[PDB]
Design a binder for this molecule. Structure first.
Ligand SMILES: [Cl-]
Ligand SMILES: [Cl-]
Ligand SMILES: [Cl-]
Ligand SMILES: [Cl-]
Lengths: 221, 225
């Protein structure tokens, strides 16, 4: 839609709820799921990629020195020869975007958890994915979304929620910060431009309506 | 098109302050009046973005203080009317940039100040020919643009601005401000009119290009856990 996004503070509150669930948990498997969904929720709100793209991120795709991420495939959901579930497709939404410092922490945290489980948990088959379940597979979309809805509801948000709304939220954020439609698309990808353009329009129209309000603040004498 | 192409808010603020400071030091009531009015005009154009000719053509009846709006319906033509008033308001339709714009409280304040001063003069000063203009000299005429520019220039010099200045830069400054506030080009255009749109366009593009470059810098402030 046109109003199909969340406010930063709504998302913050979602992430805090999920982290809270993560902390009460005893099962390490459940803890990892909730921990990671919290990371993924923030990451997507802060970077705007599709969920399929975020699930496909691998260690080599990140460049922490230059604070950039190379987005170059999505998940195909079938088993590879090793039993691993979910395989990366390399096969033109391909792009390189910039990572904030926060986004880098998020990635480092994911990778740290992954090094540890790789090393200590026999069931964790490292295939170099970053956002993984306890088996080292890219987390399944349906699972991420389920946890996200449940949190959103628990937190009293009324809107329907899913990974899409997070991507939309990032587009809404870039709009509010005065980024141009073209720059937003370089970052978020040229796919589904109708939706992107629809959000851009809605937001920039609110900003225009706020014009006299902002000018009210300006006194020079 | 450049940073020399408009003024920062604080540069405008210094200019106004310098102009008012000069006004306070003056003996001649006529000179003090010019300076006081140049200062009001400088702020008003910076806050509103009209061309100087349109600002000079503002009359009491064009202002709607209750709805905080201004009706921009004419510009000044520099010739004498049949009573000897210099500068006449032209409202011809074809040179149409006519528009209604919103005024801020400060802009309203500014207008009320100028009008109050004109009322004093209209009542006491025999040589004030009252034609309802707001931004006037002591004869009741719309102030001449060169006398505004000359004072504006000296203010800029004295305050250390090393840009080329005239009324235009104030209009450009307003456009720059609305661009930094994330106002769409369509909205800017409705407020400031379509005249010299090549310039409006180039300012908007320059600023929006700056804002795009500042993207990562802005995002660095975003943290949600
Ligand atoms: Cl963290
Ligand atoms: Cl999963
Ligand atoms: Cl005042
Ligand atoms: Cl004059």
């Amino acid at each position: 839609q046109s109003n199909a996004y969340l406010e930063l503070n709504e998302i913050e509150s979602i992430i805090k709820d999920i982290n809270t669930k993560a902390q009460k948990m005893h099962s390490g498997i459940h803890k990892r799921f909730y921990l990671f969904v919290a990371l993924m929720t923030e990451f997507q709100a802060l970077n705007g990629m599709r969920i399929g793209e975020m699930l496909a991120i691998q260690n080599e795709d990140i460049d922490f020195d230059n604070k950039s991420l190379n987005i170059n495939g999505t998940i195909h959901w079938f088993h590879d020869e090793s039993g691993g579930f979910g395989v990366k497709d390399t096969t033109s939404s391909y792009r390189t975007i910039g990572l904030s410092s926060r986004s880098c922490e998020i990635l480092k945290k994911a990778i740290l958890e992954n090094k540890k489980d790789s090393k200590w948990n026999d069931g964790y088959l490292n295939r170099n994915f970053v956002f993984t379940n306890h088996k080292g597979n890219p987390m399944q979309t349906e699972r991420f979304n389920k946890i996200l809805r449940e949190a959103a509801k628990d937190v009293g948000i009324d809107k329907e929620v899913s990974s899409h709304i997070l991507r939309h939220s990032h587009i809404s954020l870039l709009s509010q910060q005065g980024v141009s439609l073209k720059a937003i698309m370089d970052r978020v990808g040229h796919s589904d431009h109708r939706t992107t353009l629809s959000i851009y329009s809605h937001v920039t129209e609110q900003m225009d309506k706020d014009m006299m309000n902002k000018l009210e603040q300006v006194k020079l004498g």
